Swiss-Prot record, chain C:
Cell compartment(s), UniProt: Cytoplasm
Family indicated by similarity: Belongs to the class-I pyridine nucleotide-disulfide oxidoreductase family.
Protein encoded by which gene: sthA
Coiled coil regions in record: none
Protein name: Soluble pyridine nucleotide transhydrogenase
Function: Conversion of NADPH, generated by peripheral catabolic pathways, to NADH, which can enter the respiratory chain for energy generation.
Signal peptide range: none
Species the sequence originates in: Azotobacter vinelandii (strain DJ / ATCC BAA-1303)
Length: 460, 458, 58
């Protein structure tokens, strides 16, 4: 039996941020997770592995399309195992760094499944048979989520995978079917298209990423189509059948598609069933999520939830966990993480912040559009990333930025300047900043300047 | 004899920006250049070729050190010509884009050397012997500069190069000597270190880039030393001897260094000799620069000078030209706070006061550090060396200086610059705690740095 | 002209927008619907919109 001030369940970004913020306040913190190593889904099955796969695919594509390396020989494909091999060193380094972060602050860890006993007591059970009783005054729930698994899909089939088991692939398939047009599905479709796999992306809606700007979605769809990705719209699956050599999907519309593999990316379910929320009066909705208020507080006053258990973004989860820890400690570090810069790490990347075009049109705001195309950008030309764009929506009278959308090379790393300018108050948030500020050159931030001018010419 | 409201000399960033801002005002503009193509040194001989060389060398290094590509075969050294070949497509695209920009706004161009006659006319002299007369109410001077050529150096020797003709190299040398520890010198030292050339960098001072922070300079020096860049400090050249099989530099201290090539990167002199400034009474200093006020206006009321002809940065020159054009048409700012950027391997960028200036001013500041080795994006980019430092006021949390060195340093520094320019309490460190970034990116490094500051704050 | 505005996303409007964009003028096509030529295929309309936007047709 151990006693602590605050106990956090799950060692993902939310749990790590909550524990670090709470221990920074002078309290005693503990962390519980079921994985054999620290890091959570973000490092072991989420952000890090898929991002390493994407970066390796991009490097392979650039090497193949670079004439300088064509003197070495004819273009050569790479096995999926060799591509995935690069992620092991990165995940090992990340887990080592996180363990060092925990150890340097004297943070106690327990590597076992956590179950609830009462409002202040939990039992951690390891695989071997640890049965340790933990009592804490404050609780943080950061158990994340898992891929949604419908019953009628034989996930035990060797040729059917989800967003987690897809990394178990040993050989590169010739054909692939991806279901669900979510962020994960689009990212994996882009990665496998870069690898050279004819993948037939399936969408339940008519437009990919309807929450994004219409032009950005159109450009992404066109690029995917030009990159061997076949996009089908307004489709719902009827039956998935595994075979010896492939997987056949029968849609409700009547189309039957056969591939050499299958990936499911349609939604996620909260990983809270094993916790046993009935011992504290808490309940989980149909998606497995936990309802929280603006203070990230559950129905129980001393129990808090943050992260994927409620935009399902790793940075958003980390900030939500830190805010929940601040609410626990009440050290003027609480904030409701609501404005999250949307980022899709396809090839090329996509990012957005603030209002889109359709919302502005619906609200009848007198705005204007400033565009800067990456094809004319020195850095984009020099990186051989010719495709791309940057769009700035700015108020036509007050010159206040209402939304920034970018699609191309280094989208996420240049959306941040627009985000910083947008967050300013009143006249401080002005497009004219991009004219009265000297940037570097040749970089991607220079596009902002061009975009600004492309707005100012449209202003009379 | 043509007539326009405003004429521009030089088609670099300063001239292009001045012309664009002037034509935006509804006036009539003209441009003159002595090169057969538009763009200036920013595209033809300066920024773009060196950046292309840097990106190609970085890609070569990434391919060489990547275990995935090693299965194909053993590393193969790439000739300098093949590496430089990638720049031709980029310069062609840039010049086509700039020509389209000029033609879209109906901008007249004159491909010839410009000479002054009086305060309202100039003569354009072509290669085959013309004079064309141009008259403008307002004048913009953006003649830029050229590499400084001392008399005692035989630049006509095939084995002796400057910052311009170094691109004429056809074979990769084994050993190379760089004189001058300037931005260009350090950049080219990094380039040739990436290509496996035993560079012997020569510095006239004791510390590389003394205008930078001590920590950043020390890290850059350590990386260069680990990348075969033998750095010699406090050295002044005495004589240069060009052999058939090499170049031997005899220093004032008595050291004699032999290489297979030689590169001079010590300073630049403004292009004012052939401008005929004596026809207007304007005066240029020994450095070839033109003195202007805060309006970017010369002593003559209707003559303006902007750009490298006066921080010598392409973006700074472009903004200076646009500011001068705005001053002509009345939308004007003085380009003073230029974020310094050195595009070596890895890159360096900085904005605001350094730690030494803050110590001298006795401002009670504090340091927040975020090391790239622990950064997920840096680890996944295989580029682990690097750091990001934020200097913030201890009491009011006001950011007084941002320094970054590593991967994507120049693009990273822009967020800190954007926060910096805010007024009063808006420019606060706690912004990095009150905003969610994209992950995994290097921008998250800022967040870490902020926390590394807040722990030191009590 | 230096700039131009086209109202109506019909066949004639799109043809003139493409022609003028080829001529090198910033055309601002205005549509009463959410998709250009909704009676066409979605992929074809998306490709046409991408090309027009890439050719200064806002
Ligand atoms: C392929 C892919 C790519 C992604 N890319 C991005 C991206 O680029 N950016 C982004 O922001 N997000 C991305 N995500 C989303 C990311 O996975 C989540 O945002 C993030 O993992 C949520 O953080 P969290 O700490 O709140 O939850 P998690 O990190 O998922 O926390 C779950 C942890 O709790 C443990 N746990 C769960 N239940 C129990 C239990 N009963 N007992 C004990 N331990 C338990 C798990 O073992 C795990 O360690 C991606 C996801 C996927 C699948
Ligand atoms: C190797 C190298 C790398 C560099 N890298 C960078 C970098 O990464 N970032 C950065 O910001 N800066 C960089 N620079 C500096 C960059 O070259 C200058 O900042 C830039 O030239 C400034 O613009 P400008 O128009 O004043 O210069 P220029 O472009 O040189 O303008 C001068 C133009 O006018 C013409 N001209 C000159 N004299 C006359 C005359 N008498 N009559 C008519 N026309 C004339 C010239 O032919 C030229 O076209 C680099 C320079 C070098 C040499």
């Amino acid at each position: 039996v151990y006693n602590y001030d605050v106990v956090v369940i799950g060692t993902g970004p939310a749990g790590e941020g909550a524990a670090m913020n709470a221990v920074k306040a002078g309290r005693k913190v503990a962390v519980v997770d079921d994985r054999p190593q620290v890091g959570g889904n973000c490092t072991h099955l989420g952000t890090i592995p898929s991002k390493a796969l994407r970066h390796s695919v991009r490097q392979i594509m650039q090497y193949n399309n670079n004439p300088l390396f064509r003197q070495i020989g004819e273009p050569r494909w790479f096995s999926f195992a060799d591509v995935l091999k690069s992620a092991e060193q990165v995940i090992a380094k990340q887990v080592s760094s996180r363990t060092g972060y925990y150890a340097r602050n004297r943070i106690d860890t327990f590597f076992g499944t956590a179950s609830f006993c009462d409002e202040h007591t939990i039992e951690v059970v390891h695989l071997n048979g640890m049965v340790e009783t933990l009592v804490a005054k404050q609780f943080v729930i950061a158990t994340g989520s898992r891929p949604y698994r419908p019953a009628d899909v034989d996930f035990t089939h060797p040729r059917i995978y989800d967003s987690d088991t897809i990394l178990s692939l040993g050989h590169t398939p010739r054909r692939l079917i991806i279901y669900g047009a979510g962020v994960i599905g689009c990212e994996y479709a882009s990665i496998f298209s870069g690898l050279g796999v004819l993948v037939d992306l399936i969408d339940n809606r008519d437009q990919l990423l309807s929450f994004l700007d219409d032009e950005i979605s159109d450009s992404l769809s066109y690029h995917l189509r030009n990159n061997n990705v076949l996009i089908r719209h307004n489709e719902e699956y009827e039956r998935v059948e595994g075979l010896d050599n492939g997987v056949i999907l029968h849609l409700k519309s009547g189309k039957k598609i056969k591939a050499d593999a299958f990936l499911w990316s349609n939604g996620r379910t909260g990983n809270t069933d094993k916790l046993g929320l009935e011992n504290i009066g808490l309940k989980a909705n149909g998606r497995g999520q936990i309802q929280v208020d603006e203070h990230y507080r559950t129905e129980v006053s001393n129990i808090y939830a943050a992260g994927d258990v409620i935009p399902s973004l790793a940075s958003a989860a980390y900030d939500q966990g830190r805010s929940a820890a601040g609410s626990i400690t009440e050290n003027d570090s609480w904030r409701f993480v609501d404005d999250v810069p949307t980022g899709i790490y396809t090839i090329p990347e996509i990012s957005s912040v603030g209002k889109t075009e359709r919302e502005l049109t619906q609200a009848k705001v007198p705005y204007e559009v400033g565009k800067a195309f990456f094809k004319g950008m020195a850095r984009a030309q020099i990186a051989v990333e010719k495709a791309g764009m940057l769009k700035i929506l700015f108020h036509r009278e007050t010159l206040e930025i209402l939304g920034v959308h970018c699609f191309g090379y280094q989208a996420s790393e240049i959306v941040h300047i627009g985000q910083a300018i947008m967050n300013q108050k009143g006249e401080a948030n002005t497009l004219k900043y991009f004219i009265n500020t000297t940037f570097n050159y040749p970089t991607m931030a220079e596009a902002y300047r061009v975009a600004a001018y492309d707005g100012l010419n449209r202003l009379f």
